Design a protein around this ligand. Structure first.
Ligand SMILES: Nc1ncnc2c1ncn2[C@@H]1O[C@H](COP(=O)(O)OP(=O)(O)O)[C@@H](O)[C@H]1O
Ligand SMILES: Nc1ncnc2c1ncn2[C@@H]1O[C@H](COP(=O)(O)OP(=O)(O)O)[C@@H](O)[C@H]1O
Ligand SMILES: OC[C@H]1O[C@H](O)[C@H](O)[C@@H]1O
Ligand SMILES: OC[C@H]1O[C@H](O)[C@H](O)[C@@H]1O
Ligand code: ALF
Ligand code: ALF
Ligand SMILES: [Mg+2]
Ligand SMILES: [Mg+2]
Lengths: 305, 307
């Protein structure tokens, strides 16, 4: 299979499960607290690595203890971490997460070292990106850097996969360089101005993105699967049914597993199926990276289906 | 010389504070502009305020048998606090608080109780004599209610003044309220306890009357920047605080409580004592973090002797 390069963030997640989100000036006591590795970039790199991809990770951690700790872990996740830089005088990103009884969450992020992943660090990886089969990025890294990497990938026929999260508007200049975009419903609406409530809303949101120059649009619909569309022709690919416990990193797992499948030359529908399986398993576990399944587990899940 | 002895019974937390523009909304993700890890917990914040402002105080609390716990205990000892009553709970982690602070300076807090949940009636009973011989007992609501109740009863039977900062906000049984001598709710807490929303010196008085009838003689309802509505058995007087540029109001109330009791134990009349407390709190709101923002006595008097 071809080589994958993931460029993104690394976070130390602090997760507190509680009943309800604490309104202003208020205080709430949780029932479970967990400190686990997170960050969309790292989560997606782990999903790729564990699912069987040949992946290298471009990222930055701080020169702190947690940073050394996450780098050691990532290496055991089948990830080439040579491209992971240690930023002197900077702390490793941190995420403060609240989960209510309804499973919905609120995320506050301290970028830390992640804000140091600059266009300069990207240029230093020019050759790595040019020779890769695909480049997977999210929006927890500086936009200028994501833009720079996208241009290198474009100039070199390297597939550009962009998970537009966290939600935000993006310049047409970037969108034009994307081959595969994976917004969830809130992200699709934020990018196209179209709210996605049903499959019909999805198709209209996808059309906007196709017109922006993105050939493959995959709008994740949570438990409803995903609306897969290739230049206007699309359909919803249902996911698998499971009892959710924690959906943090569900989307990240979907992306990492998806690209692994595509790089193994599995047709899109099959690849999405592979991705849904990995994601389904992920939602039945707690924490971001701890809940990311391995290839053996994914295929097993698929075979028991 | 030394004023009466003060005993603070409450929580200990390690705060994880993220300053951001706007609190995020469901399913949302926001990037803040500043992150800080500092010592917190209403119990500890109030103990530090008392210690730093000059009180003779001992602290009944629990930390976990983790590194952060040993770290906070060592720090507390340097804040003029007798930490002999601080227990280390084996197999438990120290309390943690996750905090978001928006552009206006307000905050929201999510708490992982940890070892704080282990501060039991049994640990309180072990301090029976310490509480009985103290001039005052200061507590909050981040410790098990059963324990606060037990401590209140011991203090009551021994004429030990019971000062209760009813935070975080929640309803309390009449059985507890009856044992309180001084209660310091903020507006949301007053409303939560009396069912009366407080928005001005008319409502405050009405909320205060409800508490007086529950058996609490001294009711002090903090009004944020508007100071406090001080009331002793129906006779209420408003006491304005000081004007300063706020940066972080986390622990403003905690600082108020710790400084207040120190002033009262030095026999300063209530109005003066509240002024002393406002000064300490004012300084606290101009600094970041909970305990790091708590001022020392020298600083408090300076601030005062300059007004
Ligand atoms: N409740 C669920 N049950 C099974 N799979 C889910 C569930 N929620 C999400 N997934 C899986 O993870 C993917 C991403 O879900 P989604 O919520 O849209 O993304 P994100 O995690 O970024 O918000 C889905 O397409 C699906 O494969
Ligand atoms: N903006 C402020 N300016 C000056 N003092 C303040 C300010 N906010 C709080 N304080 C001080 O701290 C005390 C308690 O503040 P308040 O917001 O009512 O309580 P809490 O912090 O528990 O919610 C006040 O009585 C005052 O002395
Ligand atoms: O998508 C989930 C991730 O987003 C945030 O970056 C947290 O670190 C978490 O791991
Ligand atoms: O009152 C502020 C405190 O409340 C919570 O206990 C946090 O730990 C913080 O230090
Ligand atoms: F960049 Al395209 F269709 F993916 F123009
Ligand atoms: F305990 Al009281 F008035 F403070 F009865
Ligand atoms: Mg999970
Ligand atoms: Mg402050």
């Amino acid at each position: 299979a071809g080589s994958l390069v993931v460029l993104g963030s690394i976070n130390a997640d602090h997760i507190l499960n509680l009943q309800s989100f604490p309104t202003p000036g208020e205080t709430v006591t949780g029932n479970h607290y967990q400190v686990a590795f997170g960050g969309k970039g790292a989560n997606q790199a782990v999903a790729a690595g564990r699912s069987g991809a040949n992946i290298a990770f471009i990222a930055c951690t701080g020169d702190d203890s947690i940073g050394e700790s996450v780098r050691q872990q990532l290496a055991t996740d089948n990830i080439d971490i040579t491209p992971v830089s240690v930023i002197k005088g900077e702390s490793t990103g941190v995420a403060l997460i609240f989960v209510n009884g309804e499973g919905e969450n609120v995320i506050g992020i301290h970028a830390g070292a992640n804000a140091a992943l600059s266009p300069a660090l990207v240029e230093a990886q020019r050759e790595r990106i040019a020779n890769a089969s695909a480049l997977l990025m999210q929006l927890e890294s500086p936009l200028e850097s994501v833009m720079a990497a996208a241009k290198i990938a474009h100039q070199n026929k390297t597939i550009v996969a962009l998970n537009p999260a966290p939600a935000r508007e993006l310049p047409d200049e970037l969108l034009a360089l994307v081959d595969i975009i994976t917004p969830n419903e809130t992200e699709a609406e934020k990018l196209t101005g179209i709210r996605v409530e049903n499959d019909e809303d999805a198709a209209k949101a996808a059309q906007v993105l196709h017109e922006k120059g993105i050939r493959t649009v995959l709008i994740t619909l949570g438990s409803r699967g995903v609306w897969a569309s290739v230049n206007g022709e699309g359909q919803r690919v249902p996911g698998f049914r499971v009892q959710a416990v924690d959906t943090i990193a569900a989307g990240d797992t979907f992306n990492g597993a998806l690209i692994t499948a595509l790089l193994e030359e599995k047709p899109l529908p099959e690849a999405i199926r592979f991705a849904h399986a990995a994601a389904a398993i992920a939602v039945t576990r707690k924490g971001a990276q701890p809940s990311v399944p391995w290839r053996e587990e994914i295929d097993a899940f698929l075979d028991r289906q």
